[PDB]
């Protein structure tokens, strides 16, 4: 089983008055652990998981300083991109940033990322080799030329392959009671009559962790795409996730249909039949 640590940053300009809105969040897998809201009264990096609260004053001062610094470079970025694109000063724009590392089944480094977006579209991204850049347009090419001359990639590479992996493993251990606990989906099937001739079978998957799951419907041992509906994975609000898959069947033929569930918490795939 693989693990990841991510940091997401969003900066939305306020042309009418003041400084831009800045929201930063940190994840370990599908568990959020830290936050920063420019509109909050504390103006500090705040804990969002019980296992991170054990970190000392040095950590919280270091993380607050770094996120406040980022809030200011993204304010500058919004101003620099408005100039590159020859945009109006009256409009509100968005700068997004994301970075993080993954550890493989062997528990060592798998891959690292560091990418940006402007108004919801790709701007610049660090490639898989962590040495080169992918620039989407000519405004981004200007950023690439500057970053390659400044040897920025090398500084990001040291973190992604080193410090990022080391701290992800630390968190995974300190929060093992929850972070390394796999919660298999609580499954059941419901039956709803649509008419005297047809019926809806709904296959439920509740209270699971991680979010990654596969729900498939089969008729007489083969996959069925026709007459099915599947909602996207949604959060329950307590840290767990939910999902369902339904199928319209002729009444009296429910037995031919089987729901197959795949999840990391299940040692072998689950088969449900009405």
């Amino acid at each position: 089983g693989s693990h990841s640590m991510r940091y997401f940053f969003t900066s939305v300009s306020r042309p009418g008055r003041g400084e831009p809105r800045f929201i930063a969040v940190g994840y370990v897998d599908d568990t959020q652990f830290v936050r920063f809201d420019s509109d909050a009264a504390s103006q500090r990096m705040e804990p969002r998981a019980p296992w991170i609260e054990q970190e000392g004053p040095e950590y919280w001062d270091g993380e607050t300083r770094k996120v406040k610094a980022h809030s200011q470079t993204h304010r500058v970025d919004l101003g620099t991109l408005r100039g590159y694109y020859n945009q109006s000063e009256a409009g509100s724009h968005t700068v997004q940033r994301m970075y993080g590392c993954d550890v493989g089944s062997d528990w060592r480094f798998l891959r690292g990322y560091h990418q940006y977006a402007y108004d919801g579209k790709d701007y610049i991204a660090l490639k898989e080799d962590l040495r080169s850049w992918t620039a989407a347009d000519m405004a981004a090419q200007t950023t690439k030329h500057k970053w390659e001359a400044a040897h920025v990639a090398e500084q990001l590479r040291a973190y992604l392959e080193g410090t990022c992996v080391e701290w992800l493993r630390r968190y995974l251990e300190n929060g093992k009671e929850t972070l390394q606990r796999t919660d298999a989906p609580k499954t059941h099937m419901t039956h709803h009559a649509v008419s005297d001739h047809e019926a809806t079978l709904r296959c439920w998957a509740l209270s699971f962790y991680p979010a990654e799951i596969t729900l498939t419907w089969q008729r007489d041992g083969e996959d069925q795409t026709q007459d099915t509906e599947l909602v996207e994975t949604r959060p329950a609000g307590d840290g767990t996730f939910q999902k369902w898959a339904a199928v319209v069947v002729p009444s009296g033929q429910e037995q031919r249909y089987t729901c197959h569930v795949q999840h990391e918490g299940l040692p072998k795939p689950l088969t449900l039949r009405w």
């Binding site: 940190g26 950590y59 470079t73 620099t80 610049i124 970053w147 920025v152 973190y159 990022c164």
Partner: peptide, 10 residues
């Protein structure tokens, strides 16, 4: 923990 390298402007 976040990256301590902060000298990156677009």
């Amino acid at each position: 923990k976040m990256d301590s390298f902060l000298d990156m402007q677009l």
